[PDB]
Design a protein around this nucleic acid. Sequence first.
DNA 1: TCTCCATCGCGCTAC
DNA 2: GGTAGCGCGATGGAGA
Length: 564
Amino acid sequence: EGRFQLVAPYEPQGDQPQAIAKLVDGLRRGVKHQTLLGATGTGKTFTISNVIAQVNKPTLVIAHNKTLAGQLYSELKEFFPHNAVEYFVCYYDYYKINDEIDKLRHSATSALFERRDVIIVASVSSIYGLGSPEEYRELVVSLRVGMEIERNALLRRLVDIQYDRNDIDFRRGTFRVRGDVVEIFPASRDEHSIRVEFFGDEIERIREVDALTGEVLGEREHVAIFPASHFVTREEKMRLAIQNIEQELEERLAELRAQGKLLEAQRLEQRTRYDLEMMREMGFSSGIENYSRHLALRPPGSTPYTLLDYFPDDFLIIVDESHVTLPQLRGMYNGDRARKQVLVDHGFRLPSALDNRPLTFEEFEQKINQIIYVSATPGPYELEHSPGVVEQIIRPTGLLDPTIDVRPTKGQIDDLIGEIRERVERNERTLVTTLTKKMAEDLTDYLKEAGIKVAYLHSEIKTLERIEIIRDLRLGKYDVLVGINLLREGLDIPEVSLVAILDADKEGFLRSERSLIQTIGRAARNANGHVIMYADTITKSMEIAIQETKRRRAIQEEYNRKHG
DNA sequence: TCTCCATCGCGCTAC
DNA sequence: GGTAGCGCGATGGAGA
Ligand SMILES: Nc1ncnc2c1ncn2[C@@H]1O[C@H](COP(=O)(O)OP(=O)(O)O)[C@@H](O)[C@H]1O
Ligand code: NA
């Protein structure tokens, strides 16, 4: 039940003090919804880190993608080195890798019950279904030295919380027994296992151990062993659960036969039986999450348990890039219901599998205690519910928001080519946005023809190779990058002095108030930052973006002359 | 009611 | 009875 200790070589600067203080004040006044309107490049992760430290609550931060999530996580481990900073997302291949991520998920949920100083960076996997956090906590095996317990009953418990007996391939989520030593590999650890040495019905010693080399690392007075699955139930309840699944199965197979669908019924039966055979062995299976209703014995159509429930009631939520993350959350349920419904109709799953689902937005709302939305361009939900906004526009470095010229489309490419050439001579980079992948590739060709070092960047390119291209631009291998909608949230490249927005009047999600400001922001990390919008008209979106950027530059200039 | 891009999750379908 | 690699719905925001 510890305390956050913020570790930074610097202290709040710019308008971070007023931002940190207004947020902390609102949290202490019990304000449910708050918005931090923080321009790109102002120290937002540091700002938030200060708020978290001053209210000292377990906090959940939700990001809309994992590149950002991973960045936030690495940064928050830096700022809070002696605190529990965790990561709760699911599988991806840009940071085995699959087991590393399952390990962190268990490390996240266990940390919530062990200590108070916890920060969990998460994707929308945070609103997907888990098993009861009550069952998970009460099934924890709490081991103390000189404790009256039978080696007998310890092993009974471990199996029921999903550790596999395995004397040979001793990996995480397993345990092995040699004579009087039961050795355990917690699901939250990748390197350290637990040695538990018995003498009759008494534990004589407990040792933290490097599982690979056997190097004893030290002693332990006590140790808590959490379950190796988030969908754990008591063996007591499995007997009735398997009955209720069997009953659900026959009813469903009758539905299928009464509509023909013999191929679907055979498919369903084969699969359910296999899962049932496994449930009478241990308790788990391949797709165990789909039997959550029956396993937890809960009323049908119940609200699922999520990561939010594993948090204490007085927790804080930070929504990063809220203008994008909130719409992501909102549409998850209907999409899920639809994909699951096709599986039930084709005999891949029982209808009870619909209860294994993500929260609705309404359900999510009710699980919120206190929340802070963080966006340079917050959406209508955030503004509607928050009492005004906490504006953070003075960057700590004093870097200004860029200037924005509007130029005609006629002769635009040749204008841009000329403009790029100037930047090459000043050892500066350029970013261009177009409307499609095709146009991006076509333009990249045309620039290569004109003696410009150029490469494209869009969703067809895999994440690993994107890192390379972003590095190459920085190193000066490329001078220009042409994209569509990846020159956005979280692309921090200070070598870029020019952003060129082609088809700036082609209104829609690619050219809205929100996306324009976000794109403009890529030129705010440079002291000569400049933006050019090629267009024959100034759309309502362009108007607002130019207007807001002009206000920020003027205000920032006003600050810089005052403070040297 | 479709398009443009880019993201998440899940889970079938081939290695 | 092991897993990476696709395909799927929803979302922003307008045009058509
Ligand atoms: N209060 C501060 N004093 C000095 N430097 C800071 C402060 N806050 C942030 N920084 C640094 O300034 C740089 C730019 O800020 P950054 O945190 O990237 O802004 P954002 O994350 O909002 O885009 C970062 O490398 C960060 O380490
Ligand atoms: Na909209």
